[PDB]
Design an enzyme around this catalytic site. Structure first.
Site, short mmCIF file in Angstrom:
data_model
loop_
_atom_site.label_atom_id
_atom_site.label_comp_id
_atom_site.label_asym_id
_atom_site.label_seq_id
_atom_site.Cartn_x
_atom_site.Cartn_y
_atom_site.Cartn_z
N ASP A 183 -3.50 2.28 6.59
CA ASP A 183 -2.55 1.78 5.60
C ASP A 183 -2.37 0.27 5.70
O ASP A 183 -2.29 -0.42 4.68
CB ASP A 183 -1.21 2.49 5.75
N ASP A 206 0.85 -1.18 0.00
CA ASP A 206 0.00 0.00 0.00
C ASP A 206 0.89 1.24 0.00
O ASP A 206 1.75 1.38 0.87
CB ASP A 206 -0.93 0.00 1.22
N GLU A 253 -2.31 -1.64 -6.11
CA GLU A 253 -3.48 -1.03 -6.72
C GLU A 253 -3.07 -0.16 -7.90
O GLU A 253 -1.98 0.42 -7.91
CB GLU A 253 -4.26 -0.20 -5.70
#
EC number: 3.1.21.-
Length: 341
Positions: free
Chosen positions: A325, A190, A277
């Site tokens: 996070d 992340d 992502e």
RNA sequence: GGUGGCUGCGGGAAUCUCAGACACCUUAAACGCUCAUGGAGGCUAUGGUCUGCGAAGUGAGAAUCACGCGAUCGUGUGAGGUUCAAGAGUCCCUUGGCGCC
DNA sequence: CGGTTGATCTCAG
DNA sequence: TGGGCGCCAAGGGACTCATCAACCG
């Protein structure tokens, strides 16, 4: 197996530096001249000049007395300038009919600082050794940082980054062996402004501290820019301050790229699957509140390096379609596992 | 005598040695320099700072070591420790900073 | 012979 | 009085990443 560019640093002497400058200038000249000529031809005629027609007209130009002083320049430089112009047009025509994103019309260029020309390899025109590089119309140029090369040399991009700092990117189709089995099966990473990377596999979360170079050297950068802005254009000390600012930016990008290289290589050598992502930083940068931080962090470069080094070294990046996070990283890992299986 | 970095070479970075200036006194922060010229300004949070012991600017110059050739200093070649990692080009788009309005 | 150069290729707006 | 116009840099996003027979010194 894979294309790979070994970036080394040139140390050309006075004559070779003059020739590199002349080659970059003539490459830019032919780019502008044939952009103008193609636009004029498409205005006057039904269709503009294509790649072959441009090459033939470039030959006629070099052989002519109008610009015969462009023949003293490496041929592949001008030819690949024309190839870059034609691929500019190709990019423009890629999605004119489509409306997802508009690729802008190819424009001119006016003496930037980073000028690169490409030269190709024809029957031993490029020779790499211990501490020298063989360039067509230059000769032998003293390099440093020469890595280990065990492939055929495709092309050499002679660059210029400062008034006296020349790099050269030597492309080779090298064999890149797949790394051995990774220690851990899969993990998710992340991104984040406060903490640059939180990477976890469900048993540990080795959060990576954010360096935030751009904001960290923002005061010295501001001083450099201000010292530049008090100086007249077209001045020697203006050039000096311009090079100072350029080198500060080069140091920042060097540190950021080194950090990203180390982190991506560590991840690909540590995990078989690296989930992340598909964040779009160019959309987030419209938010001026977080735009400087997103620019400094460089999520796009991090993901590009992770993905291509995974492709080289036999790793799969399962990018997800578009505390805090830690939970986001765990969810990223779960989504990557779901996508892979 | 101790400490911290500013600038430069050492491919990048972190260190580390060397060099062109320094600053602070056992303490951690801040700033590259030399010469010539230029004449009231530069930086910063209504003020503080450097400045007619010269400000912004403008031009040049030095800033690792060995060896070769010049009349200490110029000119060429060669070397530069250490650990980590090193995929770029092209075009286009975007936004970051500064300056002025 | 070692190096340099001109022609190849497959869309348009 | 922040948006706009000049410059100086960066990143982000697709694709792409050359070869050979003739000419010349």
């Amino acid at each position: 197996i894979r294309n790979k560019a070994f970036v080394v640093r040139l140390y050309p002497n006075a004559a070779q530096t003059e020739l590199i400058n002349r080659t970059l200038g003539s490459a830019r000249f032919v780019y502008n001249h044939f952009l103008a000529r193609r636009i004029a031809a498409y205005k006057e005629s039904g269709k503009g000049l294509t790649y072959g027609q441009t090459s033939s007209e470039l030959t006629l130009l070099k052989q002519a007395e109008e610009t015969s002083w462009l023949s003293e320049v490496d041929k592949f430089a001008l030819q690949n300038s024309l190839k870059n112009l034609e691929t500019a047009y190709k990019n423009f025509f890629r999605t004119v009919k489509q409306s997802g994103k508009k690729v802008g019309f190819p424009r001119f260029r006016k003496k930037r600082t980073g000028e690169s020309y490409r030269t190709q390899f024809t029957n031993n025109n490029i020779q790499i050794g211990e501490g020298r590089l063989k360039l067509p119309k230059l000769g032998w140029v003293k390099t440093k940082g020469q890595q280990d090369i065990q492939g055929k040399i495709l092309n050499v991009t002679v660059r210029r980054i400062h008034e006296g700092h020349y790099e050269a990117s030597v492309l080779c189709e090298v064999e890149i062996p797949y790394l051995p089995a990774a220690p851990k099966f899969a993990a998710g990473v992340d991104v984040g402004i406060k903490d640059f990377a939180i990477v976890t596999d469900g048993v540990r979360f080795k959060h990576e501290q954010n360096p935030k170079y751009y904001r960290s050297t923002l005061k010295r950068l501001r001083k450099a820019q201000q010292t530049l802005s008090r100086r007249k254009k077209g001045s020697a000390r203006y050039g000096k301050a311009k090079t100072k600012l350029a080198r500060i930016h080069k140091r920042i990008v060097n540190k950021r790229q080194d950090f990203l290289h180390k982190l991506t290589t560590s991840l690909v050598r540590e995990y078989e699957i690296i989930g992340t992502e598909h964040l779009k930083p160019d959309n987030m940068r419209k938010n001026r509140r977080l735009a400087l931080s997103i620019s400094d962090a460089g999520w796009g470069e991090f993901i590009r390096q992770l993905e291509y080094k995974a492709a080289w070294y036999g790793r799969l990046v399962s990018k997800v379609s578009p505390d805090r996070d830690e939970n986001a990283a765990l969810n990223i890992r779960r989504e990557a596992l779901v996508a892979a299986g």
